[PDB]
Amino acid sequence: DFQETFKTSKRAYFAQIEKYPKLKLIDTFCFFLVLLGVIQCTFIILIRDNFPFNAFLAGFIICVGQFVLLMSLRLQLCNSFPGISKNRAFAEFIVASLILHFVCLHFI
Amino acid sequence: LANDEYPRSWEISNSWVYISAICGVIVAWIFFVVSFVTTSSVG
Amino acid sequence: RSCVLSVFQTILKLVIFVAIFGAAISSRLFAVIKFESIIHEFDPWFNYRATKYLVNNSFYKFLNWFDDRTWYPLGRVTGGTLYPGLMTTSAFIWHALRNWLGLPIDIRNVCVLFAPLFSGVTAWATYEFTKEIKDASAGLLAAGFIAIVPGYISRSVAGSYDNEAIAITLLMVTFMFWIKAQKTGSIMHATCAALFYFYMVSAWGGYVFITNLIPLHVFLLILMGRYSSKLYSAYTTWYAIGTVASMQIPFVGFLPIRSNDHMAALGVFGLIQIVAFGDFVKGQISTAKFKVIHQPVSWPAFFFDTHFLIWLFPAGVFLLFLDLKDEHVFVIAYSVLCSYFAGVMVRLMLTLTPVICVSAAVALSKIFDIYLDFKAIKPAALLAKLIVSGSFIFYLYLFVFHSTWVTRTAYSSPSVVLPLALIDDFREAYYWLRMNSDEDSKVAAWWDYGYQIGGMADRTTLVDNNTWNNTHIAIVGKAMASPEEKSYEILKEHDVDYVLVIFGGLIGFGGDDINKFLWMIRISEGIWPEEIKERDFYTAEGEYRVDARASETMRNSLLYKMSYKDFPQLFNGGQATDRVRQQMITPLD
Amino acid sequence: TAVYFLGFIATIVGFEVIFARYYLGTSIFETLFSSLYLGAPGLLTSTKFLRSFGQTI
Amino acid sequence: KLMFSIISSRIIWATLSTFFIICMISAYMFNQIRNTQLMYFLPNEFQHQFAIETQVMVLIYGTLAALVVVLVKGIQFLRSHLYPETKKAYFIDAILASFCALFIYVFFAALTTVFTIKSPAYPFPL
Amino acid sequence: ISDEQLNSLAITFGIVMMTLIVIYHAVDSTMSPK
Ligand SMILES: CCCCCCCCCCCCCC(=O)O[C@H](COC(=O)CCCCCCCCCC)COP(=O)(O)OCC[N+](C)(C)C
Ligand SMILES: CCCCCCCCCCCCCC(=O)O[C@H](COC(=O)CCCCCCCCCC)COP(=O)(O)OCC[N+](C)(C)C
Ligand SMILES: CCCCCCCCCCCCCC(=O)O[C@H](COC(=O)CCCCCCCCCC)COP(=O)(O)OCC[N+](C)(C)C
Ligand SMILES: CCCCCCCCCCCCCC(=O)O[C@H](COC(=O)CCCCCCCCCC)COP(=O)(O)OCC[N+](C)(C)C
Ligand SMILES: CCCCCCCCCCCCCC(=O)O[C@H](COC(=O)CCCCCCCCCC)COP(=O)(O)OCC[N+](C)(C)C
Ligand SMILES: *[C@@H]1O[C@H](CO)[C@@H](O[C@@H]2O[C@H](CO)[C@@H](O[C@@H]3O[C@H](CO)[C@@H](O)[C@H](O)[C@@H]3O)[C@H](O)[C@H]2NC(C)=O)[C@H](O)[C@H]1NC(C)=O
């Protein structure tokens, strides 16, 4: 069961990546936005200390929220929403990705 | 104490890691956006 | 033809908004042209004391402001104990009228007339919120109700300067911007909904409801199976921008992380993340996807506050419920949840009326869509249409007469002046104390009148209406209950110069300080049990009275001697009536 | 339409420089007024670039 | 088979939800916290009532809600389950709709009469 | 200003705002698809 769904999903995903040269750029950005959050929590687990807690929480929020806006751009960029073009999803990505950096520079 | 008279985030040397985990996402983001409108589709 | 009809619709809507922006303004103003124009109650005299500080020095000296004229041996720090947003939009309107439009007016007149000016924005926002569920013919009707209905006139009359005026508008604008981005799917409307959620989390303390009303919408929207790619983009940007914008306000600093109330939202976000991956696997296989996947209110307050909108409110939810067009679950989920909480509290009737108006202005629009849509000429059909439409237009005019009757009778009266003649003896003795006393001098009264003495007499009290440190009120109530020889020392440790006592035994005030004398004793039993006991203020066989057969330790207390001091020498013959307790006092007592 | 692209990079880099300069020591109203004077021509120019380039995105 | 048609039909959720709003807008909750007695409702006081009076309120509000929903998404079903075979059936719609309007007026007059018995000096009845 | 004139101004604005709604909804119901 899971072998068939596994190899089916690997092949049907890798063909989709090799078709469009926009998708591997998104996913290459995404994976290293996961590794930033992982080692940034590893600093907390390594030495037991919790003192500048807001400065901990700001970078972690940058990693998670910045991951999510990429996944929304990917979902909206493969299949188009009814009424929204592909020139407007990108501008909304710029504006809403540009508010979040300011409110995570005030917070540290 | 006021809200301005506090040791800043430079001077603590416990939160250099997080400032270095903000600057990377900023410059990686601008190199993302410049390298997105100067490329092709299914060339 | 299309230009003619469209121009007719536009001009007629302009005249509608010019009328319904004016009916609200004229309904709020009975207490301003009847009397003078002053701030009304206990709680709105701190806000006016804080927006008069911001307005004549900088904004930097207001965010971190330590005042030493309240809770005197240990003053309070304001910036981490109040909600800014009611003050700073008011200083913004003051700064815009003074410098740009050209006309300078006082800060007191901006503070009095802050609710009636602002209610027209609530009327427009309810128009726009109803334009999404139903076509734009019902939005004018829902906007026509909410500028009249007297469950909402009760909390914003001209003079009230409390937090709910800004709050019940920003609630509506946030729900409008969420209901746009539930249907369309775009990111930018969820960003704007996050920013008005930030501007609503800072003005008002019941922001918890809008935080726990959105994940109940999404969570009921998954169990029916209406999941799409519109929810992954509309929910998660609202949570990502809105949460970290919520943590910027101190007094709610790290509370959306540790606290129980915000847990549901976090859980829903995680749940949404999982189901987005379990939808990609479904597109590949077909077989094994089955293997994987407070006081209770009485009855007539409800008819009293809304006339016949409470009458056809449970018809609009049925007629609304036979459609299920993916944004009706918002209103159906709001209505049950809010109607349960507005039946065990008194003061959650304010969050209930923006759905009595909407759901009471949908069913009536669906009634009007067929009984005055004549388009065939027959006698009997036009008879039926004519008498049904006449039947409802009659009740709607009687709704206007009812609402403006009940505004001017019950909900229009000041607490500062007490009316065949006037009784103004509650502002003599604050202005005495402002004129004829040295400027650093402490007043010790009971905590109900803390805000008015600081606001209107301008001295440095010991307690006020906040009840922040609760073992300080017990010191003051221990002072007003002991004998004289010890209350002198307890009051002298804190450097109190003046003490003051209210008293209503002469004209029957009722809320005097003998009626509130019992609760004081109970607050002083949680700490010093040995010194004071409430088994001693009762007479033989347990009756509370003030007469010539009172207790031996009631007659020697410090709040008895200070109220009935020269009261028997006043009346003729040497006898007196108490006029509230209805008891008789002799000058040996 | 290379000069319009030149007017598209400079407003995003311009919206990062005023955030860094906000982080160092400046107050709010200088950040907000600088964000307005930079804010409007970059809106008009960037909108006309995304309209002009268009179909290959 | 059958339980999936029960959990899938929206009519029982309609009647259950509207029955919940109806039985809770007549101050059922106040009665449950502060227990009272149970001739009729307690006159001239504005904040107290007995226990049988909320039954009368539930009957009233449910009745006129039923009159309104039968007035809007109604009259087609009754004729269909009734006689169609007479003539041009517009007259059944006419007198049927008119009698529904008159029943709305009668029960609304009953409600205003009871509220003037509860709290007098109310300037307009009926 | 005596509040008798404020009373008549209040019901006057209520009736003038509340009558035009019905003719707006009658024009919009009769001469429109929905
Ligand atoms: C898409 C993004 C949209 C962003 C929308 C931003 C809209 C905010 C516009 C605010 C304009 C303020 C203009 C202003 O300076 O008025 C001031 C100060 O007036 C005030 O007190 C209120 C302004 C407080 C600003 C709150 C922080 C910024 C919140 C929005 C980012 C008058 O207050 P005053 O009390 O008279 O003195 C303030 C201090 N001085 C230095 C000026 C002496
Ligand atoms: C160029 C475009 C200009 C548009 C903006 C125009 C602004 C409208 C008026 C602003 C507020 C004025 C209201 C006001 O201050 O009057 C109040 C109370 O008097 C009243 O009766 C209240 C009248 C308010 C009705 C209009 C409210 C509209 C809401 C704000 C626009 C009485 O003031 P007093 O406090 O009594 O001042 C003393 C007056 N003596 C004569 C005793 C000296
Ligand atoms: C999904 C359904 C369940 C939802 C679960 C959500 C609830 C758990 C959320 C994480 C834990 C929250 C509790 C928490 O963080 O408490 C912290 C101190 O507590 C800590 O010890 C820090 C915990 C941080 C987690 C670090 C390990 C995480 C590893 C992830 C890979 C409070 O620290 P404070 O003492 O308040 O810091 C204040 C500092 N001042 C200077 C401001 C005074
Ligand atoms: C019409 C009026 C609208 C009222 C909204 C409510 C306004 C009050 C909320 C403020 C909450 C207190 C925040 C606070 O204490 O800090 C204020 C900083 O003050 C701020 O600007 C708060 C910013 C909060 C984030 C804004 C998110 C919106 C996104 C805008 C693009 C002080 O800023 P400053 O100290 O003046 O700037 C120096 C900061 N350095 C980092 C450079 C040192
Ligand atoms: C707590 C206060 C708030 C409570 C809210 C009260 C309930 C209001 C919202 C639910 C009412 C409508 C439910 C409904 O009609 O949908 C159920 C689909 O429903 C189901 O199959 C299972 C029931 C799940 C909905 C109720 C969940 C209980 C509440 C959990 C907290 C089945 O109808 P459907 O036929 O699926 O809807 C149309 C879709 N078809 C294409 C299939 C025709
Ligand atoms: C009401 O009117 C009086 C009378 O003018 C005003 O009093 C003025 O101000 C102070 C009291 O606030 C008077 O006494 C002075 O006190 C200062 C303390 O710093 C002291 O240094 C002086 O030597 C003097 O004793 C002052 O005589 C008086 N008149 C002036 C300044 O011309 C009062 O301000 C008015 N307003 C109120 C009470 O709100």
> In the numeric block, which tokens belong to residue C164?
């709910």
Longest dimension (CA), chain E: 59
Treating both helix axes as pointing N-terminal to C-terminal, what angle do C231-246 and A53-78 enclose, rounded to 10 degrees?
160
| Contact status, residue E25 vs residue C310, Cβ threshold 8 Å | yes
Q: Say how far residue C322 (Cα) sits from the centre of its chain.
A: 34
Instruction: Please give the distance, rounded to the nearest whole angstrom, from the Cα atom of residue C62 to the centre of ligand 1.
Output: 13
DSSP strand E in C405-454: where?
442-444
Q: Is C560 annotated as a binding residue?
A: no
Longest dimension (CA), chain C: 103
Asked whether at least 3 C-beta pairs link F and D within 8 Å, the reply is no
> In the numeric block, which tokens belong to residue C416?
């500062």
For residue C156, count other CB atoms closer than 10 A to its CB.
Answer: 24
Nearest CA to ligand 4 atom 22: C248
- Domain locations along chain D: 1-57
Q: What residue has token string 């009261």?
A: C567
> In the numeric block, which tokens belong to residue C469?
């440190």
User: Which of E25, A98, E77, E40 is closest to C191 using CA atoms?
Assistant: A98
Say whether C551 sits in a helix, a strand or coil.
Answer: coil
| Ligand 2 site, residue C33, Cβ cutoff 6 A | yes
* CB-CB neighbors (< 8 A) of B2 in chain C: 64
- Ligand 6: which atom is nearest the Cα of residue C439? 12
Say whether F22 sits in a helix, a strand or coil.
Answer: helix
CA–CA separation, C404 and F7 (whole Å): 8
Residue to mutate (ligand 6; options C430, C435, C439, C456; most atoms within 8 A of CB): C435
* CB-CB neighbors (< 8 A) of C396 in chain F: 18
C315: left (phi over 0), alpha (psi -120 to 50) or beta: alpha
Burial class (CB in 10 A: 0-12, 13-18, 19+), C58: exposed
Secondary structure of C297-319 in the HEC alphabet? CCCHHHHHHCCCCCCCHHHHHHH
> In the numeric block, which tokens belong to residue C7?
């121009």
Are the beta carbons of A89 and C187 separated by less than 8 Å?
Answer: yes
Amino acid at C218: V
| Contact status, residue C162 vs residue C47, Cβ threshold 8 Å | yes
Of A51, A56, A94, the CB nearest to B18: A56
CA–CA separation, C405 and C397 (whole Å): 13
| Contact status, residue A33 vs residue A81, Cβ threshold 8 Å | no
| Contact status, residue C332 vs residue C320, Cβ threshold 8 Å | yes
The residues near C226 (Cβ < 8 Å, ≥ 6 apart) are C326
Give B 2-21 residues with CB within 8 A of chain C.
2-3
CA–CA separation, C128 and C75 (whole Å): 46
CA–CA separation, C259 and C523 (whole Å): 29
CA–CA separation, C446 and C450 (whole Å): 7
* CB-CB neighbors (< 8 A) of A103 in chain C: 241, 244-245, 248
User: Which of E71, E72, E40 is closest to E53 using CA atoms?
Assistant: E40
CA–CA separation, C323 and E10 (whole Å): 10
Instruction: Suggest the residue from D17, D24, D57 to mutate for an interface test with chain B (most B CBs closer than 10 A).
Output: D57
Are the beta carbons of A21 and B39 separated by less than 8 Å?
Answer: yes
CA–CA separation, C497 and C440 (whole Å): 10
Which ligand is closest in space to the CA of residue C102? 2
Treating both helix axes as pointing N-terminal to C-terminal, what angle do D2-24 and D28-37 enclose, rounded to 10 degrees?
180
End-to-end CA distance of chain C: 91
Burial class (CB in 10 A: 0-12, 13-18, 19+), A26: middle
Say whether C35 sits in a helix, a strand or coil.
Answer: coil
Exposure class string for C322-338: b at 16+ Cβ within 10 A, else e: eeeeebbbbbbbbbeeb
Treating both helix axes as pointing N-terminal to C-terminal, what angle do E53-72 and C363-371 enclose, rounded to 10 degrees?
40
Q: How far off is chain A from D46, nearest CA to CA, in Å?
A: 9
CA–CA separation, C559 and C500 (whole Å): 10
Structural domain harbouring C521: 424-589
User: Which of A58, A95, D27, A50 is closest to B23 using CA atoms?
Assistant: A58
| Ligand 1 site, residue C92, Cβ cutoff 6 A | yes
Say yes or no: C241 contacts chain A, CB-CB below 8 A: yes
For residue A10, count other CB atoms closer than 10 A to its CB.
Answer: 10
Instruction: Suggest the residue from A74, A81, A98 to mutate for an interface test with chain C (most C CBs closer than 10 A).
Output: A81
Amino acid at E111: L
Are the beta carbons of B25 and A33 separated by less than 8 Å?
Answer: yes
Nearest CA to ligand 2 atom 2: C101
CA–CA separation, A77 and B36 (whole Å): 13
Are the beta carbons of A96 and C281 separated by less than 8 Å?
Answer: no
Give me the torsion for CA of E26, E31, E33, E34, rounded to 10°: 140
Q: What is the CA radius of gyration of chain C?
A: 30
Instruction: Please give the distance, rounded to the nearest whole angstrom, from the Cα atom of residue C104 to the centre of ligand 6.
Output: 28
Q: What residue has token string 């009698």?
A: E99
Q: Is C162 annotated as a binding residue?
A: yes
Amino acid at C165: A
| Ligand 4 site, residue B3, Cβ cutoff 6 A | yes
Give me the torsion for CA of C393, C396, C398, C403, rounded to 10°: -170
- DSSP designation for C171: H
3-state helix, strand, coil in chain F (%, to 5): 80, 0, 20
∠ CA E77-E20-C167 to the nearest 5 degrees? 115
Say yes or no: B37 contacts chain D, CB-CB below 8 A: yes
Q: Tell me the structure's resolution in angstroms, rounded to a single decimal.
A: 3.5
∠ CA C398-C167-C328 to the nearest 5 degrees? 70
Q: What residue has token string 């087609």?
A: E76
- Ligand 2: which atom is nearest the Cα of residue C158? 22
Method: cryo-EM
DSSP strand E in C65-132: where?
66-67, 76-77
- DSSP secondary structure of C492-538: HTTT--EE-----TTTT-SSSTTTTHHHHHHHTSSS-TTT--TTSSS
Of B30, B40, B41, the CB nearest to D12: B30
Structural domain harbouring E37: 1-126
CA distance to C3, C341, C455, per residue, from C163 (Å) = 45, 20, 18
CA–CA separation, D20 and C211 (whole Å): 32
CA–CA separation, C118 and C167 (whole Å): 11
Interface list for chain B against chain A, based on CB atoms closer than 8 Å: 9, 12, 14-15, 17-19, 21-22, 24-26, 28-29, 32-33, 35-36, 39-43
Beta-strand relationship, C76-77 and C66-67: antiparallel
The residues near A14 (Cβ < 8 Å, ≥ 6 apart) are none
Q: Is C552 annotated as a binding residue?
A: no
Phi, psi of E8 (to 5 degrees): -95, -25
| Contact status, residue C130 vs residue C138, Cβ threshold 8 Å | yes
* CB-CB neighbors (< 8 A) of B16 in chain A: none
CA–CA separation, F3 and A95 (whole Å): 52
Say yes or no: C1 contacts chain F, CB-CB below 8 A: no
- Ligand 4: which atom is nearest the Cα of residue D24? 42
* CB-CB neighbors (< 8 A) of D9 in chain B: 34
- DSSP secondary structure of C322-374: TT--SSHHHHHHHHHHHHHHTTT-STTSTTTHHHHHHHTTTHHHHHHHHHS--
Ligand 6 cavity residues, CB under 6 Å: C 434-435
Element of type H or E holding C460 = strand C460-461
CATH number reported for the structural domain that contains residue C451 in this entry: 3.40.50.12610
∠ CA C125-C131-C133 to the nearest 5 degrees? 115
> In the numeric block, which tokens belong to residue C404?
């403006």
CA–CA separation, C137 and F24 (whole Å): 8
CA within 13 Å, CB half, B2: 6
Element of type H or E holding C576 = strand C576-577
The residues near E30 (Cβ < 8 Å, ≥ 6 apart) are C296, C297, C298, C299, C343
Q: Say how far residue C513 (Cα) sits from the centre of its chain.
A: 27
- DSSP designation for C283: G
Are the beta carbons of A87 and D19 separated by less than 8 Å?
Answer: no
User: Which of C68, E111, A18 is closest to B42 using CA atoms?
Assistant: A18
Taken as a whole, chain F contains a residue count of: 34
Burial class (CB in 10 A: 0-12, 13-18, 19+), B7: exposed
Beta-strand relationship, C460-461 and C442-444: parallel
* CB-CB neighbors (< 8 A) of B22 in chain A: 58-59, 62, 104-105, 108
CA–CA separation, D45 and D11 (whole Å): 9
CA–CA separation, C16 and C12 (whole Å): 6
Beta-strand relationship, C576-577 and C584-585: antiparallel
Nearest chain C residue to A108 by CA distance is C248
Instruction: Please give the distance, rounded to the nearest whole angstrom, from the Cα atom of residue C258 to the centre of ligand 3.
Output: 7
CA distance to C128, C129, C138, C143, C326, per residue, from C132 (Å) = 7, 6, 10, 14, 12
The residues near C4 (Cβ < 8 Å, ≥ 6 apart) are none
Longest dimension (CA), chain B: 61
> In the numeric block, which tokens belong to residue C560?
């008895």
Instruction: Suggest the residue from F6, F12, F21 to mutate for an interface test with chain C (most C CBs closer than 10 A).
Output: F21
User: Which of E65, E57, E64, E63 is closest to E23 using CA atoms?
Assistant: E57
C572-581: Cβ within 8 A, 24+ apart = C578/C505, C578/C546, C579/C504, C579/C505, C579/C506, C579/C507, C579/C508, C580/C504, C580/C505, C580/C508, C580/C509, C580/C510, C580/C512, C580/C514, C580/C515, C581/C505, C581/C514, C581/C545, C581/C546
CA–CA separation, C94 and C54 (whole Å): 11
Q: How far off is chain B from D33, nearest CA to CA, in Å?
A: 22
CA–CA separation, C369 and C321 (whole Å): 18
Exposure class string for C424-443: b at 16+ Cβ within 10 A, else e: eebeeebeebeeeeeeeebb
E119-123: Cβ within 8 A, 24+ apart = E119/C300, E119/E44, E119/E46, E120/E44, E123/C405
Per DSSP, helices labelled H in E1-126 are: 3-8, 11-25, 28-33, 53-72, 76-80, 90-118
Instruction: Please give the distance, rounded to the nearest whole angstrom, from the Cα atom of residue C291 to the centre of ligand 2.
Output: 71
Instruction: Please give the distance, rounded to the nearest whole angstrom, from the Cα atom of residue D20 to the centre of ligand 1.
Output: 20
Number of domains in chain E: 1
Per DSSP, helices labelled H in C207-327 are: 208-211, 214-223, 231-246, 255-258, 263-277, 289-292, 300-305, 313-321
Of C308, C343, C371, the CB nearest to E29: C343
> In the numeric block, which tokens belong to residue C274?
């999982």
User: Which of C140, C89, C141 is closest to C115 using CA atoms?
Assistant: C89
| Sign of the alpha-carbon dihedral angle for C378, C379, C382, C388 | negative
| Contact status, residue E18 vs residue C317, Cβ threshold 8 Å | yes
